Every structure is written in structure tokens, then in C-alpha cells.
């Protein structure tokens, strides 16, 4: 339980670090596929079976398939991306990096001063999530379907060839 969680977290952080510091869109997309697999391994270590299963079903199975589809649309062969590599110049990235660094310091200082007795890792089955989803969270289900409908119709209206 501990080994899988820590290994998946380590390769997760390494993977997303390789995503944000890469120039090839397909290579970064593959790296974040690996990262999402790692987040789902973290979820399975924590006992959230439905959450990690769903991360590989749609988060690592549907949305980024559309991402690769758009990369296939554009055929990004490195035009106006790698010819300057301006995001690797230290005068560009050092400032925002120290911004996110002091933000991370503040966030982990807030996290480290809270109670904790550990996570027992008892599995939460998909039937309990289904019971709660169509129990006290029914408005969330229907209005999230409405949200998906709104995203669908706007993406249709904008993404047209004509």
C-alpha cells in the first residue's frame, strides 16, 4: 500500500515535471499519460477504486485522446515553438518558478499543521459511490449533465469548419 503510493507519486511528479519542460507536444502528452496512470495508481493505493478506474477510463482515456487528436489536427512540427525555446531562458521562468515555490512553501506549511491519524486504505466500492451519487447528490448529477450539455453545444458552435 505504501510502496505503490510513494512510487506512483514520485513518478507522477517526475512525469509532470517532464511535461511542463518539454517542446514536443506528443512527447509531453505521453508523459502526462504516464502521470495520469500514476495518479490512478495513487488512487488505487488509497482505496478509491472508482476514482482511479475512472481516471484511466476518461481522464487518461477520453480527454487526452482529444488532445492527441488536436495535435494531429494542427500537425505541430515545431513551428514557433522550438525555434526560440524562450521558456527555457532563466530570465523567463525563474520568476514564476520562485512564485510557485513560495506558494508551495505556504501551502505545505498550512498542510503540515493539521491533524492526521493516517489513511487506513479500506476500499470504497463503486456501489457505494453509485448509492450516494443518486441519493443526496441528485441535483449535482442532473446539473452536471446540464454542464456537459453546455460544453457540448458551445464546442459545436465554435469548432466548425464552414
Amino acid at each position: 500500500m505504501e510502496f505503490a503510493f510513494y512510487i506512483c507519486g514520485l513518478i507522477a511528479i517526475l512525469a509532470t515535471l517532464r511535461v511542463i519542460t518539454h517542446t514536443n507536444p506528443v512527447h509531453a502528452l505521453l508523459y502526462l499519460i504516464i502521470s495520469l496512470l500514476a495518479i490512478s495508481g495513487v488512487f488505487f493505493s488509497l482505496g478509491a477504486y472508482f476514482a482511479g478506474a475512472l481516471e484511466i477510463i476518461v481522464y487518461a482515456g477520453a480527454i487526452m485522446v482529444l488532445f492527441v487528436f488536436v495535435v494531429m489536427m494542427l500537425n505541430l512540427g515545431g513551428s514557433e515553438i522550438e525555434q526560440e525555446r524562450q521558456w527555457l531562458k532563466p530570465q523567463v521562468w525563474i520568476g514564476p518558478a520562485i512564485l510557485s515555490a513560495i506558494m508551495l512553501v505556504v501551502i505545505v506549511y498550512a498542510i503540515l499543521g493539521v491533524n492526521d491519524q493516517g489513511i487506513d486504505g479500506t476500499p470504497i466500492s463503486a456501489k457505494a459511490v453509485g448509492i450516494t451519487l443518486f441519493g443526496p447528490y441528485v441535483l449535482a448529477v442532473e446539473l452536471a449533465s446540464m454542464l456537459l450539455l453546455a460544453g457540448l453545444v458551445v464546442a459545436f458552435h465554435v469548432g466548425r469548419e464552414e
Binding site: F69, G135, E142, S145
Partner: protein, 113 residues
């Protein structure tokens, strides 16, 4: 228990042996066999911008697959949720089918010109 950790180790053994078998077969394919050189060997097979309906189909799949995951969560607890959950899933299905009918009737799913 002993049985669950035995099944977990069997699954891990399946994982690593399948990975090693596929990688070993590719390694054997790449290692063996002599190599050739030619001029048009490294040119591609051409025997000597495309439309965004692919994106529209994929994004349609994304949205309908998220609504499908909602149905996946519902399906494992149909009996325990009672008739009220069935009714709520019925407005869910009605909204989904109304959206699909809308997409059909506007040529969004109609690929042909």
C-alpha cells in the same frame, strides 16, 4: 488474508511477465537479422489541411463518455437506489437523448457534404 495477497502477487507477476515478454520479443526481433542499405529505403511510402469533423467526433465521444460514466456509476446500484434513482436516471437519459437528437438534426453527426 493469504488468498488475496496470492491473487495480488499473481496479478503483479502477470503484469511483469507480459511486459517482459513483449519487450523480449521486440528485442529478439531487433537483435537478429542482417541489415541492408539503399537510397529509397529511408524515403517514405508515397508510392513513388484536413477537416475538423474528427475533432467534433472525438469531443462528442468525450462528453457522451462522461455521461456514460455517470450511467456506469448508476448501474451498479440500481436495486438499492429504488424507483427514485430510476426516475432520476430517466431524466438523465431523456436529456442525453434530447441532446443526441439535437446533434443528429443539425448535421453535427452527419459527416457527408
Amino acid at each position: 488474508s493469504t488468498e488475496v495477497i496470492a491473487h495480488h502477487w499473481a496479478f503483479a507477476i502477470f503484469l511483469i511477465v507480459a511486459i517482459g515478454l513483449c519487450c523480449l520479443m521486440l528485442v529478439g526481433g531487433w537483435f537478429l537479422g542482417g541489415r541492408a542499405r539503399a537510397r529509397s529505403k529511408n524515403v517514405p511510402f508515397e508510392s513513388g489541411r484536413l477537416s475538423a469533423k474528427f475533432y467534433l467526433v472525438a469531443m462528442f465521444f468525450v462528453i457522451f463518455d462522461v455521461e456514460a460514466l455517470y450511467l456506469f456509476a448508476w448501474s451498479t446500484s440500481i436495486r438499492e437506489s429504488g424507483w427514485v434513482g430510476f426516475v432520476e436516471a430517466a431524466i438523465f437519459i431523456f436529456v442525453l437523448l434530447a441532446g443526441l437528437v439535437y446533434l443528429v438534426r443539425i448535421g453535427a453527426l452527419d459527416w457527408t457534404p
